[PDB]
């Protein structure tokens, strides 16, 4: 099943930098399931605001290393949300 993060949490641990318009004390109030595909090295990622899916983005591994390769340290998953490359690889991966 899906493995599930809070956005305070990402936080913490340095995945996630942060969320345009949101304070960062609601940082709670978001999560981010991620689930396995089919295509395996392809990931779905779901953010939720107070329990409501909100945006739904498919991470290709191969995209995210090439992106490590050519010194990409960040970038917005989501329109608002903006996380550590490095990071999140080991996130999806572990």
């Known amino acids: 099943k899906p ?3 809070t956005a305070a949490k990402l936080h913490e641990k340095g995945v996630l930098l942060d969320i345009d318009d949101l304070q960062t004390n609601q940082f709670k109030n978001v999560t981010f399931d991620i689930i396995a595909t089919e295509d395996v090295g392809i990931f779905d990622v779901r953010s939720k605001f107070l329990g409501v899916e909100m945006e739904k983005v498919q991470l290709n591994i191969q995209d995210l290393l090439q992106m490590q390769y050519e010194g990409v340290a960040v ?12 990071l999140l690889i080991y996130l999806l991966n572990k």
């Open 75 to 86: 970038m917005k998953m989501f329109d608002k949300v903006k996380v550590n490359v490095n």
């Open 3 to 5: 493995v599930k993060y």
